[PDB]
Amino acid sequence: CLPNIHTSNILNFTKNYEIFKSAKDTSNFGKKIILNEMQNLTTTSKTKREGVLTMNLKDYNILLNQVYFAKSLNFALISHSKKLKELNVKSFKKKYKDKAIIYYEVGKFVLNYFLNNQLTNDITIFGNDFLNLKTINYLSLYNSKNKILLQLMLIFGGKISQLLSSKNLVKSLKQATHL
Amino acid sequence: AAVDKAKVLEDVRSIISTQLGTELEKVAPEAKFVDLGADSLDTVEIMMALEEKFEIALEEEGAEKIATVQDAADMIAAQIAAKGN
Amino acid sequence: GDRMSRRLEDINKAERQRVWDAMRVAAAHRYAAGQMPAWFDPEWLQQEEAPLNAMDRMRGEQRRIGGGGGGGWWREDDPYWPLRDWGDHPMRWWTLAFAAIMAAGGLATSVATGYVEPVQAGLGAGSLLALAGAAMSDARCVPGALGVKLAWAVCALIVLKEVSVGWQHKRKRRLAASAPRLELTGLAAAALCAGYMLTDMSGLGEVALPPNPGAVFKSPDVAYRASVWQKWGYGQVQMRV
Amino acid sequence: LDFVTNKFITLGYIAPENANLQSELLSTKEIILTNSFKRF
Amino acid sequence: PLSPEDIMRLVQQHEDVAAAAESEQLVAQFRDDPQGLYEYVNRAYAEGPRRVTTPISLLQEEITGAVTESYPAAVANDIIGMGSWRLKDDVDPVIEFLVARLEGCWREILDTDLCLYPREKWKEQGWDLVDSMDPHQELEGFSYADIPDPAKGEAGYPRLQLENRVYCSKVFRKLHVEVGLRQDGLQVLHVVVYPRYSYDMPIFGMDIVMVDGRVTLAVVDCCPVRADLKLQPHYMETMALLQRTFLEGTDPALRRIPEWGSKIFSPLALCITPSGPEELAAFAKYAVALHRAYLTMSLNAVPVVAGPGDRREAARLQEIQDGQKRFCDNQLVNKKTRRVLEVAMGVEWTEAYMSQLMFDFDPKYEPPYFDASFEKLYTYFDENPSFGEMADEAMELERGAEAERA
Amino acid sequence: GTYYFLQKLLSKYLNSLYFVFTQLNQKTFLSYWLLPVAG
Amino acid sequence: LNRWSV
Amino acid sequence: YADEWGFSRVGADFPPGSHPSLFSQLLPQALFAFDARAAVAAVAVPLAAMAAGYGWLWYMHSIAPVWQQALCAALIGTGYAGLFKVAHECAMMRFIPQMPGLQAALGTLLMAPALYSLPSWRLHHLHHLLHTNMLWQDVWGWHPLTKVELADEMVRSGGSGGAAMAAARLVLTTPIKLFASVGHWLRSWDGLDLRHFHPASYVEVLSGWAAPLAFAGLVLPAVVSAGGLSGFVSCYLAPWLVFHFWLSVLSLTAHTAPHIPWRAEGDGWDAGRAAVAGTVTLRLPRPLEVLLNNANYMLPQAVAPGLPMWSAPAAYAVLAARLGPYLTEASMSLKLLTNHVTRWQIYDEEAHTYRPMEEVVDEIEADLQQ
Amino acid sequence: GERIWAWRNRSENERWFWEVFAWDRLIFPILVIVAWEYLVPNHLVWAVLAPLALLTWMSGRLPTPATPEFWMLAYFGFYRKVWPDAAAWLQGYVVPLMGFA
Amino acid sequence: FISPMTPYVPEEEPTRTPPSIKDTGTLRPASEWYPQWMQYRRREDNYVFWQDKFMRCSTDIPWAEKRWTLFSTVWYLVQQLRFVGTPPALRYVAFLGWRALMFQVYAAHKALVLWQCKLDAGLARIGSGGATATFSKTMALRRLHWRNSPLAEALYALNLYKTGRVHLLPPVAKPIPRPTFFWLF
Ligand SMILES: CCCCCCCCCCCCCCCCCC(=O)OC[C@H](CO[C@@H]1O[C@H](CO[C@H]2O[C@H](CO)[C@H](O)[C@H](O)[C@H]2O)[C@H](O)[C@H](O)[C@H]1O)OC(=O)CCCCCCCCCCCCCCCCC
C-alpha cells in the first residue's frame, strides 16, 4: 500500500526539498572567502559573481502548494522567478475589508505559533491547517478532549482576532428609559 | 523500538553464565556480577562477549555502571532499540 | 509524530542556515560594491549562525538549564588540554616547525657545501609552509582550508622530488650511490601529509572536475541536464524526458 | 496582535479586489512573528 | 606663545563646536518641511499602495493573477487605528486619534527594537486593564463587559477603568500610554516616554484631560533631565519651530503654571485649556509633530558611558538619574490632582500602582530589549534576491534570445 | 581578537563549451587506419 | 554528437 | 638643567584635556598638499644611495677592508631606512592619497625587504598612536622595564637569576639595546596567528604576511646562491642591522626620557600630555635628514595624520613657533646614546626616574626578600 | 549486489568518462593527429590543410582556434613539420625585406 | 549578536557515509546478511534494515562522495575489475579468507585491549600510590571500538602514571572527514 502524498508540510516540503537537493551539490563554502576580504583598507584584493541563492525554498513550496493543490521545485522555477523580476525592474470600505483580512491572518498564525511552539522540539515549526478525513478520524477516535480543543482553537483563532480588533459602530451611530 | 526485554535478558544471562561457568539458574536478573565473582577484567570480557553476541556497540559511557544482570540487559535492550534509526 | 517532526525541524534549520549564509555572502558582495542602504551594518556579516536558529538555541538552553595552540597544564588539572578545540588546525605547530627546520637545514647545507638547491628548495618551501601555518591558525574558514591544502601540496612536492629526482648535493659517484631514496626529510614530509589527511582536509570540496552527462542522466532537473548536455558539446541531442 | 498586524501590512497582502480566475506562512513573515513572540 | 590657559580654551572651542555641529545635523531634517512631521499619513495615503516586487508575489500574479500590495507604516497604523484595545469603543474620538497617532509613531519609528514591557512587572499583576468594581480580578479581566455601569449614587459610582500599554526600546526604558475612563464623562490620556539612564535625553510627556467630551486640559512637554532645567539646543529649536508652524495664532502665553509643573516644565512646554475645535486641532497637530520629532531624534542618540578614563560622563549619568528621579517625584506629589481619579480603586492600591508603574525610578533595574535589526536584511533580500549561477545562465540565454529576436 | 575592535574602528574610519575534442568515429571508421600503420 | 553517448 | 643629557630644548609642563589632532589647526593647509617633485625625490634619493652602495659592493666584494664594507653597509641601511619611511607613509595613507592601489603596492614592495608587513605595521602603529606613553597597553613601542616587573622576575623567580633577568640584563644594559627593533620585528609577526585579527581582514593579513615571506623565500635564496655567507652578511644582513639600528634609535629617542613619565589609563594619562609633551624630536644633520626621509620628525605626523612627509620639518617649525615651552628637542650625539645605554634602563613607576639596572635591583634585592 | 549498487551510485561520472569520453574524445583524436603528423611528409597540404579537411569532415566541426584539434594541428603539424621550411624561407626573403639581419 | 550561550558550532555537511546498521565498529567481521539484533526486536519495526541500504547507497549519498577527481577516475578501474572483471567465485573465496583473517585480528585486538586494561591498572597504581588500582571499563570499550586518538591514549596513560584518576577520560575522537584536494582527489 502506498498511502497518499498530498500532505501539506511533510510529504510536500521534504519531498520537494530532497528532490531539489539531490540534483546538484549546492555547496558554497569557497564563496565565503569574500567575508574575509572586508577590512582591506585599499580598493581591491562587485557584480554577478554572487552565485548564491538567497531565497528560502519554503516560499517556493508555499507557492507550489497555493497552486496545483489549494510543476515541482526545480531550477526552472527559480529561473522563471528571476525572469519575472527582471521584467518588473469609497476607501473606508477598503480599509475595513483589509483590516479584517489582515487581522484574521495575524490571529490565525499567532494561535498556530502559540499552540505549536509555546507549550527535541527546538526548531520553530509552523504547523498547517486543513485537517483531512484521515486526520479527523485519528483525532476523533484517539487523543482527548484537550487535543481536539487545540485543533478547534487553531481553526477559530483568526475569527477571534477579527472580533477582538473590530470597532463597534453603535456608539458612533446612535446619538442622544434605559438611556 | 519494542525490544523483547525477556528474550534479551534470557540471552544476556546465558552469555554471562557461559563465560563464567555457572548455570543459567545462578545467573538471576537481580544478581550482581560481583556476586558471581567475575573480576574487573572478567566483567569487561563479559561486556565484550555481549557485544559480540548481540552485534551491537555497547554504550561506553555507563559501562562503569553496569552492576546487575538486569542493568546489563536493560542497557543492551536500549541499545537494540536505538540501533534501528 | 516524531522522527518526522525531527526531520522537518532539521530540514528547516539547515535551510535557514543556508539562506543566512547566502544572504551574508550576497550582502558582502553588494557592500563591497557600495550598493548597500545606509542602515546596513557590515558587522552583521560576522554573525555566523542564522538568527532564528540562534533564537531557537537560546530557547532550548533557557528551557533546559608543550604550550602550543592554547594553554597547558601538565599533569595537575585539565590533562587532556591538547584535544580541546582552540580554533586552529592540529598540524599548525607541526607545519611551522617543519618550515623552521627546512629553512635552517637548507641554509646550513648550502653554507656547508656550496650547492644552491638546498637553500632554494629550503627557504623557498619554508616560506610557503609558514604562510600555510599562518593560514591554518583559524581552521574554520576558507583561509584554513586553503592553508591545509597548500601545506599538503608543498609536503607532497617535497616527497615527490625526494623519491623521484633526489637532492643535488646528495649526488655521488656511483649510480647505485646516487639512489634518490627516501631520507628523513621525505619521511617527515610524508608524515605531515598523512597528518593532514588524517586530521582535516575536507573543505573546498565544491572544487572538483565538472560533472559529466553521465551524472545528470537520471537527474530530475531538465535544466541541469540540458546545461551539462550543452557544456559537454552535445547540446542538440533530443532529451525525450 | 497590533504589532504583528502593523509589521504585516508593510510586508504585503492580497487585497480583495477580486482579480483572480495561506496555511504555511512565508519566511520574512515568520521571522517577524517569531521576533514578536520573543517575550522575556 | 600658546599658554596653558589658551590650550584649554582651544579644547573648549573644539568640544562645543562638535556639539553645535551635532545639534544642527539633528535639526536640519525638520528645518525644511515641518508639516512633514504631521502630514506624513496624508502623504503616504497620496503615495498609495505599493506593488510588492518580490519573486514569490510576481509568480503569484503570473499564475493566479492575485496582486500582493503593501502599504507604508503611516497608513498601516492609520488602518489599524486604536487597535485591539479592550476599551476602544467607550473612548472619545480625540483620545482615540491621539492614541492611534502616538502608538503608530512608536511602532513605525522604533521598529526592530520596540519590545513589549516584561509581563511580570505590569501584566502579571493585572494592571493592563483595571476596573473599579473588580479590583481583585475575579472576572479574569472581563469586568468591562461582564459588569454593567453603576447606577447614580449606588456604590461603585462613578466607575473608573484604566487600560495601560507599556513598551520598551533601545533608547527608551518605558513608553507608557494610560487611558482612564469614568462615568461622569471624564477621560484621561497619559503618555510618557522615558529615556534610559545612559542618555542625555528629556522625558516626553502628554496629558489630555476632558470632561463630558470637552477638552479641559491639554499638556505636551519635553521635560528636561538636567540640573539647570534647560533642554539641548536641538530640542529648543525643534519645539520653537513646531510651535511657530502649528500653533500659528492664539494667545502667546497660554501657561497658567499651576505650582507643580515649575520644577519639570521646559521653557517651551505647552499646557493649554482648549477653547475651540480650531485650537484643539492645532494642539493635536503640534503634539503629534513634536512626538514624531522626538522619536526621530531618538534614532541617532548615543549612550553615555563612564568609569575609567574620565568622570564628567559619570557626573552626566548622575545628573540624568537625578533628573529622572525629580520628574518621578514631582509626578508622585501630584496627589492634589490626577490621583483624585484614583482612591476609588483604594489608597494602598493607588500607591502600589503609582510607585510601581508609570513613574518608577531604580538604579539597578534596566528593562531588557530585543534589537532585531536583521528583519531589514530579510526584507531587503526578499525585495532584491540573488537567484544563483544556473538562473544567471538561463537569464543569459533569455537575453541572447531577445537580442537575436527583437 | 586583540586587534578586533581596533580593526573595526579603522575599517569604519573612526565560451559555453569545454576545451574538449569531438569523436571522429561518429561518421567513419577510417580514422582507425592510422593507428596500425603508424604503429 | 551521438544519442547513445548521453 | 636638562641639557645635562643632550636633551637641549626641554619642555616645562602641559595641561591635560587636550587631543593632538586639536593642534592640526595650527598648521596651514599649504603643508597638506601633494608635491610630486618632493615625492619623487623622497623615493629616489635613498634609492640612489642604496644603488650607489650596491654598485660599490659589486665593484669591490672581498678585496675591500672591513671598515670600507661597514661604511658601504651603513649607507645602504640608511637608504633603506629612508625607503622604509616612505613605506610607513604609504601605510599611513598619506604619501599618494590619489592612488590608494599604487600607495599600497609601493608600501608593500618597500616593506618586503625589511621582512615587515604593511597591514600589521599600520595596525600596530595605530595602536601605538592611540596608546602613546600609556603603561601596560602600548606594547608596540619602547615600553620600559618597570621595577615592579623586575621585582617579579627578581623574587617570584627566586634570587637574582632567571631567564628574563639574564635576557633583560643582556639587552637593556648593552649597545644591543640599540638593535631591539629586531625583537620588535619578531614580535610583529603576531606568532603568525590570525586569531588576533578581525575575521573580515584575514585575506589582507595573509597577503601582508606573504609578501615578506615571498621576499625571504625568493630573493634571500638568490642572495645566498650568489655569494654564500660572505655574500649574504655584507649584502643583506649588515644593511638590515643598520636599518634596525636606525629604527631602534628613532623609536628610543622619540618617547623615552627622565622628564617624560609613563602613566597607565585612569592614573592621569592624557593624549596631549603624552604626544605634544612626551615626544623628543631627534635632530640630525641635513644629509641624514634627507637620507632618512625626515623620519625623525614624527610629532607633526602624530598631531596631523594626513600631513605628508616632505612638509614635516616646516610643520614642526610652525609647531615650535606656536606651542613654545611644551616641546622637547635633542641633537643626535654620543651623549644621548651612552645615557640610553648606561643610565636610563629601569623605570620606577613612582617619579619617572629611569635608573641603572643594578641600583634598582639593589632595592628589590637587598630588600623585599630581605 | 548491494556493494555494486552503492559503488554505481557513488561514481556516476567516472563510468561515463571511461565508457564515452576517455577513448573517443580524449585519446583517439590525439593518437590519430600524432599518427598523421608522424606519417605524412613535411608538406603544408599534408600537415595542415588535408588534416583540417579530414577532421572537419569526420567530426562535423571546423577546427576553430577555440578547438583543441586546431592547436594539435598547429603544434604537431605547422610547428613540427613546415615551420622549419617557413623559417628558412622567411629569414631569407621577408626578414631582409623588412630591413633586418 | 544573538549569541546562544554555547559558541555556535557550524554543522558542515557529512563527507563520509554513516556506517551501516549491521556494523560492529570493533574490527570484527559483520554478519553475513542479518545483523542478529533483529531477532531481539519486534517485527514491522525492523523496517530500518533496508532503510539503511536505502539512504546509505541510494537516497542520502553525501556529495563529497560523488566528487569526480583523478584519483576517483583511477579507482573506478580497481572497483570495475573487482566487480565485473573478477569472477564472483574467486571473490567469494577471497571474502571467506578475509573474514577469517579479520576474526583472528579481532581476537588479537581484544587480547591487546585486555592487556591495556592491565597496564591501565598498573599505571593507575604508580601515580596514586596504591589506592587506585582499578581501570576504566568505558575506556576499555573505547579502545575496543577505536574511538580514541593516539594523542588521547598517550594523554590518558600519562594522566594515570602521574596523578591516577582512572575515571577522568579524554574526549572521544571525532570521525576523520574525507580529504579533498581540488581535482586531484
Ligand atoms: C572452502 C574453500 C577453500 C578456500 C577458502 C579459504 C582459503 C583461502 C582464502 C583466499 C586466500 C587467502 C586470503 C587472505 C587475504 C584476502 C585477499 C585479499 O586481497 O582480500 C580480498 C577482498 C575481500 O573481499 C571483499 O572485501 C571487501 C573490502 O574489504 C577489505 O578489502 C581489502 C581486503 O584485501 C582491503 O584490505 C580493505 O582494507 C578491506 O576493507 C568487503 O569488505 C568484503 O570483505 C568482501 O566483499 O576482496 C577484494 O576486494 C579482491 C577480490 C579478488 C582477489 C582474489 C584473491 C584470492 C583469490 C583466490 C582464488 C583461487 C581459487 C581456489 C580456491 C582456494 C583459495 C586460495
From TrEMBL, chain B:
Modified residues annotated as Phosphoserine in this record: 40
Shown part of the complete sequence: 33 to 117 of 117
Domain of life per record: Eukaryota
Residues of the Carrier domain: 6-80
Single GO molecular function: acyl carrier activity
Protein name as it appears in the record: Acyl carrier protein
Its biological purpose: Carrier of the growing fatty acid chain in fatty acid biosynthesis.
Family: Belongs to the acyl carrier protein (ACP) family.
Keyword line: Fatty acid biosynthesis, Fatty acid metabolism, Lipid biosynthesis, Lipid metabolism, Phosphopantetheine, Phosphoprotein
Automatic annotation (TrEMBL), chain C:
GO MF annotation terms: fatty acid transmembrane transporter activity
GO CC annotation terms, alphabetical: chloroplast inner membrane
One BP annotation, GO: fatty acid transport
Organism domain of life: Eukaryota
Protein name per its UniProtKB record: Uncharacterized protein
Organism lineage: Eukaryota, Viridiplantae, Chlorophyta, core chlorophytes, Chlorophyceae
Residues of the full protein shown: 93 to 365 of 365
TrEMBL record, chain E:
Keyword Lyase appears in the UniProt entry: no
Keyword Signal (UniProt): no
Keywords from the named record: Oxidoreductase
A biological-process GO annotation: phytochromobilin biosynthetic process
Disulfide linkage: 115-168
Single GO molecular function: cobalt ion binding
Protein family membership: Belongs to the HY2 family.
Protein name as catalogued: Uncharacterized protein
UniProtKB/TrEMBL annotation, chain J:
Name of the protein: Uncharacterized protein
Organism, scientific name: Chlamydomonas reinhardtii
Residues shown, of full length: 71 to 255 of 255
